[PDB]
Design a protein around this nucleic acid. Structure first.
Ligand SMILES: Nc1nc2c(ncn2[C@H]2C[C@H](O)[C@@H](COP(=O)(O)O)O2)c(=O)[nH]1
Ligand SMILES: [Ca+2]
Length: 581
DNA sequence: CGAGTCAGG
DNA sequence: CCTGACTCG
């Protein structure tokens, strides 16, 4: 470990402000909202510089350089720095290259989380892993200034050298536009969404928490009665001892550890003993309480009564976003009790409203586009109820002969075909035999032979090329596609069929977000994006903007790309997220 | 901190 | 098929 030379600067000079630089604005805290910036590094043609943040960020020339978009910066995780700067009232502009997002497009499977891991991709090893410098556990700490300053300078030096080879490879992959015109501009939009946050009505939440605690308390006693003794209901082991050993309930399923107590199992067991539907009710209410009442309350900021999620833009293997702390992509919607949680998410100004627009069946629509199946494309061109139609074709019955159970099964087929669900997968979800499931699937392929062609083709393409691709050229490598293990190979085959479907739907909505943000600005609307939930966008805006958004938002989303079938977008607005339905 | 469970797509 | 949070041992 020899030293990399740099100026440990005590003040900002003009040569620190060239119009191209690798920049590091280092935020050590995992969650970067309102977090400290611990140090700054700049590398450019004139040399290598460490600046303390109290100096650099009080310097009006450095600040102006930060916000000048003609001063081009290369970074890693620009969103982290952008947001932590927004919290100090400082704008970051002119980020022309984000190494994190470059690594993520070249290979999402690398799990690139720091500069050093991106650097390894190009055999560059003169930089340490953040974990090696900072530590990990309760032991994660900012080191002393010489250790820190060298680490930041090494990171910036790595960014300066790696930009060339990352761009060369993106270019060869035809992903250069995906980075420059899609992921990098999206990064700025997510930063605004995160910084803006979502207002929470903590009273509504605390009241719901009271009612839940009362019910949960009733159901808790009833379970202790029905078992003739008290035990930890949240312990799957202890519960498994009450059900299958004290009460003698049949064992239909085992886990790898012991007895399964998963919902699926428990519904099957419901007829034999009363305590079963109480354990089910308890699980339901206990999830709402500990995760959605207690969990949400703990992360709202008492300064603003907002939650500020972080959208992970470089995590998922398909090009989706994810969301953390809080996860605002899994707020309950399916059952009414949980859905009421959404009444707690409110507009951030008085006389503003929540507006939600969602693609209708985007994944099936994309499948129809990519497979070019005549029947499926016709169904969408007719805007048919797609599950009813699938039931008609697979059971060869007419429309008003479709029973609700038949529609439910065609629906489970439509849900699974977008990832090439196997006969076993479908049998499981439908509670039927694998041979019956195989038949449904065989009937599906007779009605949608283009889907079948697609599934065979995409698997051959994954084998020959080594990867699959989405509409805007995102990639996923699938080395398991040739494995001699059947289970392993089967998974890779489902990933081959799913990834272009799911990833292309991620592409489209990401584009919609970019187009929407440009149109909102052109229109000078005060409306702004709050959330993305995979196929849905949630905004808040003045009440006076609602009629305009009813037209503009679906429009932008529908026209984001042009497929062989229309994209269809529904939209709703109201006083609270719950009411925007 | 792996496993299980369950919330969403 | 793609996720994240909570709890337990
Ligand atoms: N790995 C791990 N095992 C635990 C813990 N507590 C109880 N057991 C068994 C814990 O914190 N970690
Ligand atoms: Ca407990």
């Amino acid at each position: 470990g020899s030293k990399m030379a740099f100026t440990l600067a005590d003040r900002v000079t003009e040569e620190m402000l060239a119009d191209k630089a690798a920049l590091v604005v280092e935020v050590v805290e995992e969650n970067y909202h309102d977090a400290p910036i611990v140090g700054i590094a700049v590398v450019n043609e004139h040399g290598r510089f460490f600046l303390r943040p109290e100096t650099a960020l009080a310097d009006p020339q450095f600040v102006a350089w930060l916000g000048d978009e003609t001063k081009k910066k290369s970074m890693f995780d620009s969103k982290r720095a952008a947001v932590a700067l927004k919290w100090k009232g400082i704008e970051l502009c002119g980020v022309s290259f984000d190494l994190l997002l470059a690594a993520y497009l070249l290979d999402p499977a690398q799990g690139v989380d720091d500069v050093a891991a991106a650097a390894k991709m190009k055999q560059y090893e003169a930089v340490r892993p953040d974990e090696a410098v900072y530590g990990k556990g309760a032991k994660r700490a900012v080191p002393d200034e010489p250790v820190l300053a060298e680490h930041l300078v090494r990171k910036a030096a790595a960014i300066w050298e790696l930009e060339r080879p990352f761009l060369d490879e993106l270019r060869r992959n035809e992903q250069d536009r995906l980075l420059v015109e899609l992921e990098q501009p999206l990064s700025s939009i997510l930063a605004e969404m995160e910084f803006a946050g979502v207002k929470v009505d903590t009273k509504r939440l605390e009241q719901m928490g009271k009612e839940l605690a009362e019910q949960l308390g009733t159901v808790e006693q009833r379970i202790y009665e029905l078992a003739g003794q008290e035990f930890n209901i949240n312990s799957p082991k202890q519960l498994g001892v009450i059900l299958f050993e004290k009460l003698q309930l049949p064992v239909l399923k085992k886990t790898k550890t012991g007895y399964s107590t998963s919902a699926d199992v428990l519904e099957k067991l419901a007829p034999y003993h009363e305590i079963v539907e109480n354990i089910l009710h308890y699980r339901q209410l206990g999830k709402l309480q500990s995760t959605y009442i207690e969990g949400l309350l703990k992360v709202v900021r008492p300064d603003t009564k907002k939650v500020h999620t972080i959208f992970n833009q470089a995590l998922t293997q398909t090009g989706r976003l994810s969301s953390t702390e809080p996860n605002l992509q899994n707020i309950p919607i399916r059952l009414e009790e949980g859905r009421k949680i959404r009444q707690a998410f409110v507009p951030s100004e008085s006389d503003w409203l929540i507006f939600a627009a969602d693609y209708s069946q985007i994944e099936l629509r994309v499948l129809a586009h990519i497979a070019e199946d005549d029947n499926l494309m016709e169904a969408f061109r007719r805007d048919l109820d797609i599950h009813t139609k699938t039931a008609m074709d697979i059971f060869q019955v007419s429309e008003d002969e479709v029973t609700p159970n038949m529609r439910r099964q065609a629906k489970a087929v439509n849900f699974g075909i977008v990832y090439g669900i196997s006969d076993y997968g479908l049998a499981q979800n439908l509670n039927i035999s694998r041979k019956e499931a195989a038949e449904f699937i065989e009937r599906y392929f007779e009605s949608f032979p283009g889907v079948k062609r697609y599934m065979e083709n995409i698997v051959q393409e994954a084998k020959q090329k080594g990867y699959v691709t989405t509409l805007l050229h995102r990639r996923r490598y699938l080395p398991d596609i040739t494995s001699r293990n059947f289970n392993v190979r089967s998974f890779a085959e489902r990933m081959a069929m799913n990834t272009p479907i799911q990833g292309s739907a991620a592409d489209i909505i990401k584009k919609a977000m970019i187009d929407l943000n440009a149109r909102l600005k052109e229109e000078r609307l005060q409306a702004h994006l709050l959330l993305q939930v995979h196929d849905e966008l949630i905004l808040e805006a003045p009440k006076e903007e609602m009629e305009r958004l009813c037209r503009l938002v679906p429009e932008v989303m529908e026209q984001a790309v042009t497929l062989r079938v229309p994209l269809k977008v529904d939209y709703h607005y109201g006083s609270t997220w719950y009411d925007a339905k």
